[PDB]
Design a protein around this ligand. Structure first.
Ligand SMILES: [Cl-]
Ligand SMILES: [Cl-]
Ligand SMILES: [Cl-]
Ligand SMILES: [Cl-]
Ligand SMILES: [Cl-]
Ligand SMILES: [Cl-]
Lengths: 162, 162
């Protein structure tokens, strides 16, 4: 198990434009295209992202390329963030994966605002952090995924993914 | 394909201590234990790395954990290096993987010294860079692996791994 296999499990793989859990146009392995209600806007974002006229469909190779960029972007976002970097630096590799997962799903700014949970993680109070993380819209709206991610933070193991 | 799958192909997976291509004690997915000729020294490094008395054998989970740390370390090494960071920043995701691969194999300092090849990469002179990279002990000692990595730099595709 690793960050790519973890997110592939959590995000799935679909080669045609679809709506994600929040109702937003998405493709590939959780590649958010746009929060716009317009399918045409989503198609234009897709063509720009892939560099050709796709008409709403991509190949597995193309999906994996967007995925690589998106994981890269989540890590870069963490490293550039004054709130996230200290926490990330303090974690082991498995828990780093859990943080990357959250940022991938919610964005840098979204996760950076979880001040209390981040403090507990930095303090290595794993059970307390886990309980605090579950007090979130994130947990309530995607409970099975959030439970897997929280288990990863709680245990520092890949048990929730095996 | 991604950096983990790429290195897993290039490094293999072995659960008992073995000697790598340079004759150095190694385990898992290309986890170098020590350059020391002493198997006992290698066993001590392994126990320290895993956090238990292993007697020269690890599980697949443990091998994957060392692998996660080692990929993380290669990326951190690139980002902290004044010579490597500018090149890495200039590359697309696929070619970033090729650079991580080199650092994983040769180390931060080893790759950072390839001044001419790094310049050609930064300049996006892909064919020239590819020819220059092959003028190396690296290429001569591990030609099939180096060819795959160079192809990745030349094309910005995963063709050498599919
Ligand atoms: Cl656009
Ligand atoms: Cl869920
Ligand atoms: Cl599920
Ligand atoms: Cl030691
Ligand atoms: Cl080789
Ligand atoms: Cl081979």
């Amino acid at each position: 198990m690793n960050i790519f296999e973890m997110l592939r499990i959590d995000e799935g793989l679909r080669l045609k434009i679809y709506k994600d859990t929040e109702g937003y146009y998405t493709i590939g392995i959780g590649h958010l295209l746009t929060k716009s209600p317009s399918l045409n806007a989503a198609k234009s974002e897709l063509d720009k992202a892939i560099g050709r006229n796709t008409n709403g469909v991509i190949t597995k190779d193309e999906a994996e390329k967007l995925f690589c960029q998106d994981v890269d972007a989540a890590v870069r976002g963490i490293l550039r963030n004054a709130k996230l970097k200290p926490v990330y630096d303090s974690l082991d590799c498995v828990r780093r994966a859990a943080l990357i997962n959250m940022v991938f799903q919610m964005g840098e700014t979204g996760v950076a605002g979880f001040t209390n949970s981040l403090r507990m993680l930095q303090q290595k109070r794993w059970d307390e952090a886990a309980f605090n993380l579950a007090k979130s819209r994130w947990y309530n709206q995607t409970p099975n995924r959030a439970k897997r991610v929280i288990t990863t933070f709680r245990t520092g193991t890949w048990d929730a993914y095996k």
